[PDB]
Symmetry: C2
Subunit: 105 residues, 2 copies
């Protein structure tokens, strides 16, 4: 599953429940074509990879979280572990997403 982050403290709650697991966060908008195209692939990946936590942040609903992470393109995938940033990817390139999750998991 891909869990939808509700607000700043909810994002922190999720980053903790992840324990030591890689967390992949998709920053998206509902008006954005490339975001809608890749969303189902992220959902398929999340059902299989139970040792990675997948989250999503709607930038219109969570403008403060978007500003905290310096988002400018969408989708942007942020890679985190233990509350700390590992890597980011801008755009819907599913092979680069898979490479980054392989690298970081």
């Amino acid at each position: 599953m891909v869990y939808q982050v509700k607000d700043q403290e909810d994002f922190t709650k999720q980053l903790n429940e992840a324990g030591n697991k890689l967390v992949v966060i998709d920053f998206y908008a509902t008006w954005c074509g490339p975001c809608k195209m890749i969303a189902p692939k992220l959902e398929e990946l999340s059902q299989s990879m139970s040792d990675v936590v997948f989250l999503k942040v709607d930038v219109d609903e969570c403008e403060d979280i978007a500003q905290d992470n310096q988002i400018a393109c969408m989708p942007t995938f942020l890679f985190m572990k233990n509350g700390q940033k590992l890597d980011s990817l801008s755009g819907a390139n599913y092979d680069k997403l898979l490479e980054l999750v392989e690298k970081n998991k």
Copy 2:
């Protein structure tokens, strides 16, 4: 001064108000750092140039307009003249912007 488009009808009103002038529309968000960096440069070009009209669209306030224009990064600049799309530029590349303004005005 850069005018903020309020809604789809207002976009048509301003396209009509521009007459035969090139129109540059900055699709931006208030949480987006590169947009904030370039906004004062746009205000300076808007006060400087009398043969170009500068508009802005807040993607979180006009999500419909952003969808219809296939926005995915920000800022994105659309270049229009007599209702026609001439060019677009993704990102806060001020030199490219000025080059597309000089080419199309």
